Amino acid sequence: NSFVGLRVVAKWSSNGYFYSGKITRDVGAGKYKLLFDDGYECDVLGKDILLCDPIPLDTEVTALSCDEYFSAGVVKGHRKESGCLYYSIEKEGQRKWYKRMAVILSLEQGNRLREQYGL
Amino acid sequence: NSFVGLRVVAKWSSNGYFYSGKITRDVGAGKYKLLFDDGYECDVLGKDILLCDPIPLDTEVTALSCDEYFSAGVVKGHRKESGCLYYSIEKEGQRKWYKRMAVILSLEQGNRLREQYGL
């Protein structure tokens, strides 16, 4: 049951989005240190951490982009190119590719995925 | 007079990068509430906030990319298309376009700009 170095989607704020990152260390009491893709390293409780290296397909997510700001869409495909992972988020009936860090889950979506994928 | 609604590059961690965002509110004691482009809204001290809506040209920055991870480069141009702003970061003698959220300043790089652009 090694959970070190596994990419996970976890929230680091009491009321915030579930941002993507990777587990850098497994501390006691189920509190894992996560280095997030944006460079912020901090400790997060297992409940707040979702063990989803590939974002599940056909899962509602929040896509962050300069255009449309914080849109809501559904994953409709994955594409790993030269290590870079992209998710095909369908917003308003239109599929667009978003980087791993450009896709984060809302509180409701994170809670929905916690039941199945939750540390 | 007011700094609210002005894009700024500020750090929200004691030892962290200067992430881009926008001032959502001006609170007392020079402590401004910033909504960052990643959706994290929190209060930041004026020292940690850099007033640079367009990232300064010919300024050393840290480009975050899936490939090359946290590379370092220098801005060599800007391009705003349909609101989306891209910076031409020159890494290893090669100019590559990065989104606004894809470019963040390091501790030393951000400090170097504090003397000029610092709240």
Author numbering:
A (entry chain A), B (entry chain B): 1484 to 1602
Provide the authors' original text about this structure:
The DNA damage response protein 53BP1 (p53-binding protein 1) influences the cell cycle dependency of DNA double-strand break (DSB) repair pathway selection. The localization of 53BP1 to chromatin also requires that it binds histone H4 di-methylated at K20 (H4K20me2) via a tandem Tudor domain (53BP1TT), while BRCA1-BARD1 recruitment requires unmethylated H4K20 recognized by an Ankyrin repeat domain in BARD1. We show that a series of water-soluble small molecules targeting the methyl-lysine binding cavity in 53BP1TT function by stabilizing a previously unknown lowly populated autoinhibited homodimeric state of 53BP1TT in which the histone binding surface of H4K20me2 is buried within the protomeric interface. Our work therefore identifies an auto-associated form of 53BP1—autoinhibited for chromatin binding—that can be stabilized by small molecule ligands encapsulated between two 53BP1 protomers.
A low resolution (3.79 Å) model of 53BP1TT-CC derived from X-ray crystallography data was sufficient to demonstrate that both protomers were arranged similarly as wild-type 53BP1TT bound to our small molecules with a root-mean-square deviation for backbone atoms of 0.94 Å. Using NMR spectroscopy, we independently verified that 53BP1TT-CC mimicked the homodimeric state of 53BP1TT bound to UNC3474. Noticeably, the addition of UNC3474 led to the splitting of several NMR signals in the 1H-15N HSQC spectra of 53BP1TT-CC. The addition of the reducing agent dithiothreitol (DTT) changed 53BP1TT-CC to a monomeric state as expected, which, like 53BP1TT-PN, had no affinity for UNC3474. We therefore created 53BP1TT variants that can be switched on and off in vitro for ligand binding. As we showed in vitro, 53BP1TT-PN and reduced-state 53BP1TT-CC cannot dimerize and are thus insensitive to UNC3474 and to the related, lower affinity compounds UNC2170 and UNC2991.
